[PDB]
Ligand binder design. Structure first.
Ligand SMILES: [K+]
Ligand SMILES: [Mg+2]
Ligand SMILES: [Mg+2]
Ligand SMILES: [Mg+2]
Ligand SMILES: [Mg+2]
Ligand SMILES: [Mg+2]
Ligand SMILES: [Mg+2]
Ligand SMILES: [Zn+2]
Lengths: 202, 91, 97, 97, 128, 216, 25
RNA sequence: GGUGAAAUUCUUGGAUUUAUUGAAGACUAACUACUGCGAAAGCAUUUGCCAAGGACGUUUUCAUUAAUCAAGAACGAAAGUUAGGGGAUCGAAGAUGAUCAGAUACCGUCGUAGUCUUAACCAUAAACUAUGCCGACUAGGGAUCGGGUGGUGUUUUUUUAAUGACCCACUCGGCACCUUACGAGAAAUCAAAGUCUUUGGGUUCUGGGGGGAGUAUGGUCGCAAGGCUGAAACUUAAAGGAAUUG
């Protein structure tokens, strides 16, 4: 509930005690029930397996990638997102990766990640079509919907509120050094308007 | 007798929401409620639970998949890229 | 009227040929058209064969060649004088000079 | 390759389609070859190889699933395994491996 | 045979000429003087007089380092460009030989595709 | 203001024993400093050398061998086989008009874990009384020739190592083997193996490198 | 005028005439 | 870099060039031709499946089952109806720098929609051979592709054998080409554009001076651009084709 992607319940054996150990993974697309999941340094390059990032070749698609070794997953967790391995730097071991945002990150080769893409992709391609469907979506997440516009407020409530017409009055691009109560609008915007150009700036 | 000309499953929305928005919902709704062939038992018995969960009524197998279709375009390209990289490793 | 019985160059049984690009201006022109010359030259000129003979190890070994196929559009071929206009009677001659 | 060899079998020879008939023929020992579809469960596949090992019966693996195996046999349903009891006028019992 | 070998890589485009000497491996370049900095006119950068002036400066430096002989590899722009070596290629190759350096194994290394990506102009050409 | 050329050594390049002239040439590297050695700066260099210079004969003037530096010991570095390529002069000269260009390639590993891609080329020809001027081959002949070439190119690398492959790439035994197996389909002039590529290398196993070296 | 551009000019005029037909009834 | 010259742009944060290693992006450069296949649009390195097709061979089989076709369908160059990815070479536009009297263009640098999805085009092109399809006859020649037939022919090796490949001859079916003009045409030219005032082999579609005009209106396909069907008023003595001399 509140998560677009499904989860997978994986049962391991405790290596130091006679019992079972159930984990909750984010399900990769293609993982099915009754499938054996191999996790470790010597696991193979199969969808669903958990491997160190230094044990995979360049161009491998991973998900639920650890930011640091042992933090049990930080990057590319949302549905339909993934991380590409773009390079290794073996001495002082590191691994350059590409994040879903397009940013390039350098993290340790001991950090782990699950081979594949996160299941449930293409979810946002469907229009919500109704106020009731955005109601039920945020009913399971937090209290952030619906939103009243700031120009419809009174000046007591918002920087944008007030006026004999509905208008901002001053520039909506706000400095990064502005303080709380002033940061309404476009915080530290480098540019505005319709994006006439490309991404991944050099 | 054929009942609607072009709305199909989206006739339950009447005249609301706009025609172009009703067309995009119609395309993904036919996929979402479609019946798919199981890759384990071979029967066309795979239906969606929630988004990303696809269960076969026979043979009781649940496969992680896309939100509105069993397999996405990205996953198949990833699956082929992973196989090519794996066969390079094991050779 | 119809100037040439080949309507330019010889398609005569295809319907479509994939085009090539001109080497002087990069104009797209079909491959049945697009005048082709085979440029074979030594990578040292005749004024440097004598020069390169004394300054060479491996005495009298070889002298390799450059092999290049050049494609010209009609406007570039006429302007570069690899092909000129000729009389109506001499337009029919298909033999190389 | 395997399709018209099977098409010679079902026209002349004897056969059984399905798991329970195949195990019965293997147990009573008149199965000459069993053909397993590609998507047969591995536990069911492993049980057939053990029955075939006990009865000294060759095992062929069909390249497609149960839908394709029943089609190549000549039926309109799904066939997971097929056991050949008589080859008929077919060379499917010799042209293997 | 006490000759020590280098590799003289000559890049002869129609805009400028490069004379470039490395060792047997392509790492650790010895000398590289282009044709465009022996004449300051911005249009004679590809001229043969510019290319021979550059080739003397490689040979003076190669003599100082210790390199006596060279394997010359010559290329044009290549790719989707002209494939014809520029006017500076023939002057630079000649001027290296008369400078006292020895030469062996002349080879064409122009990058030639296998019907790769698109080209200049856009189907009607650079029309003038 | 530094004059960086008066801080470099010179290292001798040593070819494997499968060739005759094992002295290839000299290469430079910088002085070894604190946390910056010269061994790691030389251990990946690839040297392109003509097969004529390795064998001394001028018959191999159109082939080149890639040699990759693996180990350094005592101011000379030991190279291994990295790949064979044809010169652009002959590769473009055997491609003539009015004949059929036949190319076959395959990817296969040696007895040791050396994954290679081998490229072969062949050309149709007239035979001594032909009046017609092109001597093309039908598409069924090219498919039959490619099947024979790929079978020969596969069955040969199964029973050999990289050292054994390099030994028999010199006297053109493969081209005679292709010719004797395809002469009943088409005349097939100008048979060559035009390129071999190193795809995957195994572990370093330095004793196999020292076994290839260690003479002279 | 070139016949390609006279064809293009007629299409704009045909489209804008239909728009004028639309804002009235 | 880049150009006719230049300029925009990147350059001790090391550009350009060199090496090594990777990762995504039409198609398959050379081979490639007066060569092949397909109803057309169109289709080029492999390899494997799945069905399909022409020609040839045939002392096999049916026996008129056929030709062209209103209505009615299928198929489709590309360039944008619409919804993921990957990432610019070219210019729409757009940004800029030139040139110019201006330059919103040609030229230079970069870049969003724009021949890469899986899913429709209503179906438009100088969709051209500007030449409907089926059948018969009329004129010579040399090539070439696919099949077949013959040679007290060549070569490949076991000595010749079997194939294959090549040479000579013939035949069928194709893509075409060369010479003449009996013949046609206004001519250009044409083995069909011939067998037409000595005018009839069968059949389908289209045109009737130039515009107005593929416009108006109605219908229909049409969430779109727009296709398909489609006038009139009025206006005009030429418009047009081929060739000759300047
Ligand atoms: K306000
Ligand atoms: Mg909102
Ligand atoms: Mg609001
Ligand atoms: Mg108020
Ligand atoms: Mg108030
Ligand atoms: Mg306030
Ligand atoms: Mg304020
Ligand atoms: Zn199932």
């Amino acid at each position: 509930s509140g998560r677009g992607a499904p989860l997978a319940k994986v049962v391991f054996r405790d290596p130091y005690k006679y019992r079972l150990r159930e984990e909750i993974f984010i399900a990769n697309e293609g993982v099915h029930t009754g499938q054996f999941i191999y996790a470790g340094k010597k696991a193979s390059l199969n969808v669903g397996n958990v491997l160190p990032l230094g044990s995979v070749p360049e161009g491998t698609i991973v998900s639920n990638v650890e930011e640091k070794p042992g933090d049990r997953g930080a990057l590319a967790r949302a549905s339909g997102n993934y991380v590409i391995i773009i390079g290794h730097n073996p001495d002082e071991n590191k691994t350059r990766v590409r994040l879903p945002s397009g940013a390039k990150k350098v993290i340790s080769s001991d950090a782990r990640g699950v081979i594949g893409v996160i299941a449930g992709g293409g979810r946002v391609d469907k229009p919500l079509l109704k106020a009731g469907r955005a109601f039920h979506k945020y009913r399971l997440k937090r209290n952030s919907w619906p939103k009243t516009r700031g120009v419809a407020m009174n000046p007591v409530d918002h920087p944008h509120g007030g006026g004999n017409h509905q208008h901002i009055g001053k520039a909506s691009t706000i400095s990064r050094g502005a303080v709380s109560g002033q940061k309404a609008g476009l915080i530290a915007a480098r540019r505005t308007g319709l994006l006439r150009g490309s991404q991944k700036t050099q | 007798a054929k009942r609607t000309k072009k709305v199909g499953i989206t006739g339950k929305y009447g005249v609301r929401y706009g025609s172009s928005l009703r067309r995009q919902v119609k395309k993904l709704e036919i996929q979402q409620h479609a019946r798919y062939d199981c890759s384990f038992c071979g029967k066309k018995t795979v239906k969606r639970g929630a988004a990303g969960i696809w269960t076969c009524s026979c043979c009781k197998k649940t496969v992680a998949g896309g939100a509105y279709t069993v397999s996405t375009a990205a996953a198949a390209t990833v699956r082929s890229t992973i196989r090519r990289l794996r066969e390079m490793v094991e050779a | 009227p119809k100037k040439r019985a080949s309507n330019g160059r010889n398609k005569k049984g295809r319907g479509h040929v994939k085009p090539v690009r001109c080497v002087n201006c990069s104009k797209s022109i079909p491959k049945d058209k697009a005048i082709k010359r085979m440029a074979i030259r030594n990578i040292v000129e005749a004024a440097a064969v004598r020069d390169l003979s004394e300054a060479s190890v491996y005495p009298e070994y070889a002298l390799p060649k450059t092999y290049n196929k050049l494609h010209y559009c009609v406007s570039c071929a006429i302007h570069a004088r690899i092909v000129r206009v000729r009389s109506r009677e001499d337009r029919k001659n298909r033999a190389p000079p | 390759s395997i399709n018209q060899k099977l098409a010679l079998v079902i026209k002349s020879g004897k056969y059984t389609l399905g798991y329970k008939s195949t195990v019965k023929s293997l147990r009573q020992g008149k199965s000459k070859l069993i053909i397993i579809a590609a998507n047969t469960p591995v536990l069911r596949k492993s049980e057939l190889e053990y029955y075939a090992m006990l009865s000294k019966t060759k095992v062929y693996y069909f390249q497609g699933g149960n839908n394709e195996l029943g089609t190549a046999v000549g039926k309109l349903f799904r066939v997971g395994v097929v056991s050949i009891l008589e080859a008929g006028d077919s060379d499917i019992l010799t042209t293997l491996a | 045979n006490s000759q020590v070998f280098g590799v003289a890589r000559i890049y002869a485009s129609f805009n400028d000429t490069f004379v470039h000497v490395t060792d047997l491996s392509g790492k650790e370049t010895i000398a590289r003087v282009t044709g465009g900095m022996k004449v300051k006119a911005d249009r004679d950068e590809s001229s043969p007089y510019a290319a021979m002036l550059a080739a003397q400066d490689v040979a003076a430096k190669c003599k100082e380092v210790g390199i006596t002989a060279v394997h010359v590899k010559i290329r044009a722009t290549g790719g989707t460009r002209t494939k014809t070596p520029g006017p500076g290629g023939q002057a630079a190759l000649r001027a290296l030989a008369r400078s006292g350096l020895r030469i062996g194994r002349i080879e064409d290394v122009t990058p030639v595709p296998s019907d790769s990506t698109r080209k200049k102009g856009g189907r009607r050409g650079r029309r003038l | 203001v530094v004059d960086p050329f008066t801080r470099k050594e010179w290292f001798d390049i040593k070819a494997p024993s499968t060739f005759e002239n094992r002295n290839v040439g000299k290469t430079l590297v910088n002085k070894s400093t604190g946390l910056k050695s010269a061994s790691d700066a030389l251990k990946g260099r690839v040297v392109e050398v003509c097969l004529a210079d390795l064998q001394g004969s001028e018959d191999h003037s159109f082939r080149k061998i890639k040699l990759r530096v693996d180990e350094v010991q005592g101011k000379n570095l030991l190279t291994n086989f990295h790949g064979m390529d044809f010169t652009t002069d002959k590769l473009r000269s055997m491609v003539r008009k009015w004949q059929t260009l036949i190319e076959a390639n395959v990817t296969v590993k040696t007895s040791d874990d050396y994954v290679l891609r081998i490229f072969a080329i062949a050309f149709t020809r007239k035979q001594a009384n032909q009046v017609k001027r092109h001597s093309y081959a039908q598409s069924s002949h090219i498919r039959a020739i490619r099947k024979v070439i790929s079978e020969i190119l596969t069955k040969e690398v199964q029973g050999s190592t990289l050292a054994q492959l390099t030994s028999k790439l010199i006297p053109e035994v493969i081209n005679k083997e292709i010719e004797n197996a395809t002469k009943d389909i088409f005349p097939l002039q100008n048979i060559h193996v035009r390129k071999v590529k190193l795809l995957k290398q195994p572990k370093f196993d330095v004793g196999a490198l020292m076994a290839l070296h260690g003479e002279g | 005028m070139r016949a390609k551009w006279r064809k293009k000019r007629t299409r704009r005029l045909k489209r804008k005439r239909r728009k004028v037909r639309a804002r009235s009834k």
